[PDB]
Enzyme design. Structure first.
Site, PDB file in Angstrom:
ATOM      1  CD1 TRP A   9      -4.080  -5.302  -5.295  1.00 54.75           C
ATOM      2  CD2 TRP A   9      -2.514  -3.638  -4.453  1.00 54.75           C
ATOM      3  NE1 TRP A   9      -3.124  -4.721  -6.302  1.00 54.75           N
ATOM      4  CE2 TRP A   9      -2.256  -3.964  -6.104  1.00 54.75           C
ATOM      5  CE3 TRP A   9      -1.822  -2.689  -3.808  1.00 54.75           C
ATOM      6  CZ2 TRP A   9      -1.192  -3.129  -6.460  1.00 54.75           C
ATOM      7  CZ3 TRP A   9      -0.814  -2.293  -4.475  1.00 54.75           C
ATOM      8  CH2 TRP A   9      -0.362  -2.334  -5.787  1.00 54.75           C
TER       9      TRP A   9
ATOM     10  CB  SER B  96      -6.925  -6.872   3.041  1.00 54.81           C
ATOM     11  OG  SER B  96      -5.804  -7.563   2.655  1.00 54.81           O
TER      12      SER B  96
ATOM     13  CE  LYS C 175      -5.867  -9.261   7.028  1.00 55.62           C
ATOM     14  NZ  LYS C 175      -5.879  -9.377   5.668  1.00 55.62           N
TER      15      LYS C 175
ATOM     16  CB  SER D 114      -3.554  -5.443   5.731  1.00 51.83           C
ATOM     17  OG  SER D 114      -4.601  -5.611   4.982  1.00 51.83           O
TER      18      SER D 114
ATOM     19  CB  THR E  26      -6.212  -0.626   2.370  1.00 52.50           C
ATOM     20  OG1 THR E  26      -5.082  -1.081   3.072  1.00 52.50           O
ATOM     21  CG2 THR E  26      -5.811   0.940   2.323  1.00 52.50           C
TER      22      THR E  26
ATOM     23  NE  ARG F  51      -4.441   0.427  -1.939  1.00 52.67           N
ATOM     24  CZ  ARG F  51      -4.248  -0.479  -1.096  1.00 52.67           C
ATOM     25  NH1 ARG F  51      -4.821  -1.618  -0.947  1.00 52.67           N
ATOM     26  NH2 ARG F  51      -3.006  -0.295  -0.402  1.00 52.67           N
TER      27      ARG F  51
HETATM   28  C1  LIG Z   1      -5.298  -7.159   1.420  1.00 51.81           C
HETATM   29  O1  LIG Z   1      -6.076  -6.939   0.545  1.00 51.81           O
HETATM   30  C2  LIG Z   1      -3.956  -7.790   0.919  1.00 51.81           C
HETATM   31  C3  LIG Z   1      -4.217  -9.433   1.329  1.00 51.81           C
HETATM   32  C4  LIG Z   1      -4.965  -9.917   0.158  1.00 51.81           C
HETATM   33  O2  LIG Z   1      -2.573  -9.871   0.938  1.00 51.81           O
HETATM   34  C5  LIG Z   1      -2.858  -7.071   1.679  1.00 51.81           C
HETATM   35  C6  LIG Z   1      -2.517  -7.567   3.075  1.00 51.81           C
HETATM   36  C7  LIG Z   1      -1.529  -6.816   0.993  1.00 51.81           C
HETATM   37  C8  LIG Z   1      -1.688  -5.679   0.418  1.00 51.81           C
HETATM   38  S1  LIG Z   1      -0.557  -4.862  -0.874  1.00 51.81           S
HETATM   39  C9  LIG Z   1       0.116  -6.184  -2.097  1.00 51.81           C
HETATM   40  C10 LIG Z   1       1.287  -6.625  -1.430  1.00 51.81           C
HETATM   41  N1  LIG Z   1       2.635  -5.984  -2.078  1.00 51.81           N
HETATM   42  C11 LIG Z   1       1.951  -5.421  -3.357  1.00 51.81           C
HETATM   43  C12 LIG Z   1       2.454  -4.412  -3.739  1.00 51.81           C
HETATM   44  O3  LIG Z   1       2.535  -3.363  -3.164  1.00 51.81           O
HETATM   45  N2  LIG Z   1       3.276  -4.127  -5.124  1.00 51.81           N
HETATM   46  C13 LIG Z   1       4.374  -3.435  -5.361  1.00 51.81           C
HETATM   47  C14 LIG Z   1       2.415  -4.722  -6.198  1.00 51.81           C
HETATM   48  C15 LIG Z   1       0.409  -5.399  -3.234  1.00 51.81           C
HETATM   49  C16 LIG Z   1      -2.479  -4.818   0.880  1.00 51.81           C
HETATM   50  C17 LIG Z   1      -3.050  -3.624   0.880  1.00 51.81           C
HETATM   51  O4  LIG Z   1      -4.057  -3.294   0.922  1.00 51.81           O
HETATM   52  O5  LIG Z   1      -2.181  -2.784   0.366  1.00 51.81           O
HETATM   53  N3  LIG Z   1      -3.132  -5.580   1.793  1.00 51.81           N
END
Ligand SMILES: *C(=O)[C@H]([C@@H](C)O)[C@@]1(C)CC(S[C@@H]2CN[C@H](C(=O)N(C)C)C2)=C(C(=O)O)N1
Length: 246
Positions: free
Chosen positions: A192, A52, A55, A99, A190, A232
């Site tokens: 992930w 992300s 973005k 995000s 952020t 994070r």
């Molecule tokens: C950004 O990097 C990410 C994109 C790639 O989808 C985004 C929008 C999702 C998340 S968190 C991800 C969704 N739920 C998971 C979670 O929390 N668990 C329990 C594993 C992880 C993020 C982010 O930066 O948190 N952005």
């Protein structure tokens, strides 16, 4: 007389990451000087998918090439999104804070594969490779970037030194404001990437101190599924305090 263990900020941040049982690096840049902290310094020069954090660049490219504007409301067209908080009409800037992936997929498809690859290569972002899939090349490869490259990019953004118009960079900066207190401002994005293995977590941004000084950061760590997303933010804020940046 006993010995005393002297815990400098280098040791503290290294052990912050150890406490979470994962590998991570914190890249800091200010006054064109980069410092590395954390327990896995070799991450700083390793390529990861930006997830992300891309973005930021997506928004710059879309605004610069007039594929959108900061007041356009992207409509939620009715699919079940990953979060209920995403299931509303929203601007590019609101989607940045949330995000909200589907808004930036819409934008990426407006830019198109041709213009996107050419703008990414013009900026020189990471390995500058986006392949053939215009809606996920920042999530599952082939685009990769090192944490040092992200701190260099975000510090240029904060200083309005990227190869974009001043107004476009100013508008994207305003989308990234996370926190304001006591004359300090913190901006960041952020990320992930959950679908690749190992998972990668990002938090890239900068602090504006009361005297206007900019201190940019790129946090990069290995994630696991049981971690809370806020890990994070916790690691970043504790390390920034230890470094006297806030
Ligand atoms: C950004 O990097 C990410 C994109 C790639 O989808 C985004 C929008 C999702 C998340 S968190 C991800 C969704 N739920 C998971 C979670 O929390 N668990 C329990 C594993 C992880 C993020 C982010 O930066 O948190 N952005």
């Amino acid at each position: 007389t006993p010995s005393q263990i002297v815990q400098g900020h280098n040791q503290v941040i290294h052990q912050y990451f150890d406490e979470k049982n994962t590998s991570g690096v914190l890249v800091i840049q200010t006054d064109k000087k980069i410092n590395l902290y954390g327990n896995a310094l070799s991450r700083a020069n390793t390529e990861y998918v930006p997830a992300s954090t891309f973005k930021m660049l997506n928004a710059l490219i879309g605004l610069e090439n007039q594929k959108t504007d900061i007041n356009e409301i992207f409509k939620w067209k009715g699919e079940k999104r990953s979060f209920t908080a995403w299931e509303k009409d929203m601007t590019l800037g609101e989607a940045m804070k949330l995000s909200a992936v589907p808004v930036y997929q819409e934008l990426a498809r407006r830019i198109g594969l041709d213009l996107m690859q050419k703008e990414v290569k013009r900026i020189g972002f990471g390995n500058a490779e986006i392949g053939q899939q215009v809606d996920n090349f920042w999530l599952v490869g082939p685009l990769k970037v090192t944490p040092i490259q992200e701190v260099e990019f975000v510090s240029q953004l904060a200083h309005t030194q990227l190869p974009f118009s001043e107004k476009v960079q100013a508008n994207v900066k305003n989308m990234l404001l996370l926190e304001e207190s006591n004359g300090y401002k913190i901006f960041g994005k952020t990320g992930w990437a959950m679908d690749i293995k190992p998972q990668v977590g990002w938090l890239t941004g900068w602090v504006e101190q009361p005297d206007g000084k900019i201190v940019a950061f790129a946090l990069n760590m290995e994630m696991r599924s049981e971690m809370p997303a806020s890990i994070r933010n916790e690691l970043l804020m504790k390390s920034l305090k230890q470094l006297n940046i806030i």
